Write a protein that binds this ligand. Sequence first.
Ligand code: HEM
Length: 137
Amino acid sequence: GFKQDIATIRGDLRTYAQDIFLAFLNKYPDERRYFKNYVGKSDQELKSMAKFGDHTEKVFNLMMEVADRATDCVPLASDANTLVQMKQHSSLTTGNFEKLFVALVEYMRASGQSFDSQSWDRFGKNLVSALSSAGMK
Ligand code: HEM
């Protein structure tokens, strides 16, 4: 279930973080414009870029903390507020986050692995609602 998936992701966070983040950028290539250091870099070039690994790790660690603090895939309003108020997110809208969760759920469905994809899609929906409530356009 969803709690086991957090443990699966955390066990190999760097690899899952890098692989899901790349799946996101490759499915929605316009999103790469927000990451001006990752423009014009192949998957293997980014795996060799220390800041890419550090960024993706820090993003997925926070995502897994928000997921673990959720109850029945409902995130805390305080965690949504953190994601809205972050300086690095100031230009974003809820559609950037729904694209990340669409990509994440499709990655999970395609993997060899027994992810609770329906729960990640619900979590993403609930998080988008919470981001909108915390003032994201
Ligand atoms: C639940 C989803 C997300 C979480 C948990 C998250 C978390 C984070 C964290 C923790 C950082 C700082 C990392 C560091 O200092 O190295 C960060 C940076 C950033 N985030 Fe997000 N983020 C999310 C979704 C998104 C989305 C959908 C976008 C844009 C499409 C985005 C754009 C950025 C950008 C542009 C930065 C600055 C890049 C950098 O660290 O150099 N984030 N995010």
